[PDB]
Structures are given as structure tokens and as C-alpha cells.
């Protein structure tokens, strides 16, 4: 994730044709400690990855900070800078980084006393598979401004905000948004698929 | 809703013989500005509507107000302040009003600079059916000490929080949430449409 966003894409990515470019981006700006955001990817993570998977959709993924604090011991821009050191070393390991820090068992309560320091997070990024540079570039805080100017970057202040394609997506169900981008990419092979095990999880 | 919670029953209500007592009964604790309660709401509140309406269960709703403050106009509390407000006149008025606080064209972003003052949370509830005590009620803020206490009354910290006769429930699905209730209740007349309507919205 060079580069604002985080693109998450498979070797069978459907492209326009004459240009490298995805026939469909959907973008995700996200904060780890927004609970809207882990209640949005606990229900639609295995949808888009998916998607991913078929090569239907790249997934751009901008981790913001705005719930950022102290009385939150910024765990907000810890673990998003966190991501884009995980994504520096792999985009597999982002992927699995980021299902990580949204899964009911580690995503912390907004408003709680508890948030995992970055010793945790680097744990978190091993068990993603990946140290490098990683270890580093969390204690160092390399990323701390960068994502504490993303929302400002990307005028983004309410989260989970979803685009496709540029344009704001008034998401709902994960079948509805295979629906969506079965409109823009057509019944290419897996896509049904995604459509009903997404009816259904 | 005298009483911690606004209890929200239909004449069906299913009860435990030899008491008035309902066989199942579904805790709500919600924040008016949490962003999560409010997908939650508009995911699940059909739903929750239809198992009270068939007599499945009695929906009790205990209005916290832990975001709240002047940074937020104190929109949290006087929002729960006004649901209650509204429920002391009618329970039908509370069910309409409750769900159009959480509706997508009415919720305020939790970040943002605009949220709906007393004139407009008093035109919501006379939207909503009732007027009566309620605009001297909201005017007056005759409730916002008690709402204010309630999450340390409930131990309710994080939103929403769900329990099922008690026990703490972890939600997916509404449909699943008609699962866990027929569990309790059985198959009675309109649990097993409510099901199938909710694996469809
Ligand atoms: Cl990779
Ligand atoms: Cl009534």
C-alpha cells in the first residue's frame, strides 16, 4: 500500500480491456477501533475476499485514524499504521492483518480500558507471517502521520465509508453488493457463487 | 417505559403458563449516536418488529447515552432522554420513533457538526404519533439525569449489547436471532415467515 490505499487484488483480476486497470475498485476507508467497521467486515470480510479471490473486484483498502486519542491509548493510529507496515512486507499478510484486527476476539471496545500496545500488534503481524521490517516499523511509529492525515486526505470523517469505482455505495447486505458489482464485471466464473454463500453466512 | 427498559409487547405475546410472564424476552442497549447501533437497528429492527408483533418475544429497549457529549450537542442523551419522553405517551409512538432515530436519513454521523436539537427531536415524536407531555418533557430535559445514569445501571459500556432472557447474546443475523428465539418459544404461527423474510432484507 504505497499509496493512500492498500490494494488487495488476485492474478484473476478481470481488467478493462486494452489497460491493466480493474473493471471494478471497491474502496473501503476504515478505522480499527470503529465498531461499525468490525461489525461491517465480520459480515462482509468473506464476500470481498472472495471477490478477490475470482478476480471480480481489486479491494483498495485506506485505514484512517479519527477515532484517534489518548484516552484510547491511540490504538486508532497505532493499528492502522500497523497495516500499512504489514502491507510494505505483504499484501497476503495485510490480508490476513487486517481480518485479524476486526475479528470478534481482538478488536477492542471503543470505549474501553484495554487496547493493544505495539508489542501486540507485532504479534498480530507474525501470526499474519511476516517480521521484517515490520517490528521496527511499528515501534518506530513510522507510519503515525501518514495515517493521521488520511482522513483529511480523503475526506473521509464517518466509517465504514465504501466506494465503487469512485462513487459513495450505499452498502446493505454482502449479496447485494455481489449484485452491484456482477452489474459492472458481468457473471464471470465464482461470482454466483460468492452471491450465494454470501446469502448465507 | 417506567422502568430502566421500554418494554414493547403485542396482545400475542406468548407467556409462561401459570404467569403473565413472557416466555422470551430480547434486551436492547443502545446509544441514539452510535453508528453501530444503527446498522444494527436497520438490519435487525423488521425482524425484532415481526417477533413482537407475532408474540415471540417482548423487545425491552434501555436507552444509554455513554457517547454523549458537548462535542455532540449531548445528542446521546437527549435523544434517549426523548424516547422516553415519547414512550411515557404511547408504546406504538416509541417503536415508530426509536426506529426513525436510527433510520439513514435521520442518525447523525457521531464525528459531525449537525445534530437534531430539541425542536426537531420534538417533531420526531409528533411524526412519530404523540405530543401530549412530551415537548414540556424534552424542553425541560426531565430525563436526561436518568439516562445519563443508566449505562453504569445496566453495566453497559459498549453498544449495541443484546441479551436473551438475560444472557448476553453475540448476534450475526436476524435470521439467526429467529433461530435462537424458536429455540425458546417453538414454532408458533409466524416464526418460521419471520425467518425466511429475515434471510431476505
Ligand atoms: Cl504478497
Ligand atoms: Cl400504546
Not at 464476500?47 to 485505514?63: E, H, N, P, Q, R
Not at 486508532?76 to 512486507?89: G, T
Not at 511499528?138 to 469512485?166: F, Q
Amino acid at each position: 500500500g504505497p499509496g493512500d490505499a492498500v490494494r488487495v487484488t488476485s492474478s484473476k483480476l478481470v481488467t478493462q480491456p486494452g489497460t491493466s486497470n480493474p473493471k471494478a475498485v471497491v474502496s473501503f476507508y476504515e478505522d480499527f477501533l470503529c465498531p461499525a467497521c468490525g461489525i461491517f467486515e465480520r459480515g462482509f470480510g468473506p464476500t470481498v475476499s472472495k471477490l478477490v479471490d475470482i478476480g471480480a473486484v481489486a479491494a483498495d483498502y485506506t485505514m484512517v485514524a479519527i477515532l484517534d486519542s489518548a484516552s484510547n491509548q491511540h490504538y486508532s493510529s497505532r493499528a492502522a499504521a500497523a497495516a500499512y507496515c504489514v502491507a510494505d512486507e505483504s499484501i497476503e499478510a495485510f490480508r490476513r492483518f487486517h481480518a485479524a484486527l476486526f475479528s470478534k476476539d481482538i478488536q477492542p471496545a471503543e470505549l474501553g480500558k484495554d487496547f493493544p500496545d505495539n508489542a501486540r500488534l507485532i504479534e498480530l503481524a507474525r501470526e499474519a507471517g511476516v517480521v521484517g521490517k515490520v517490528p521496527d516499523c511499528i515501534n518506530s511509529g513510522k507510519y503515525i502521520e501518514k495515517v493521521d492525515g488520511l482522513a483529511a486526505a480523503v475526506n473521509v470523517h464517518a466509517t465504514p465509508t465504501v466506494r465503487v469505482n469512485g462513487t459513495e455505495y450505499e452498502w446493505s447486505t454482502p449479496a447485494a453488493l455481489v449484485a452491484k458489482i456482477k452489474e459492472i464485471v458481468g457473471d464471470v466464473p465464482g461470482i454466483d457463487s460468492a452471491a450465494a454463500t454470501a446469502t448465507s453466512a
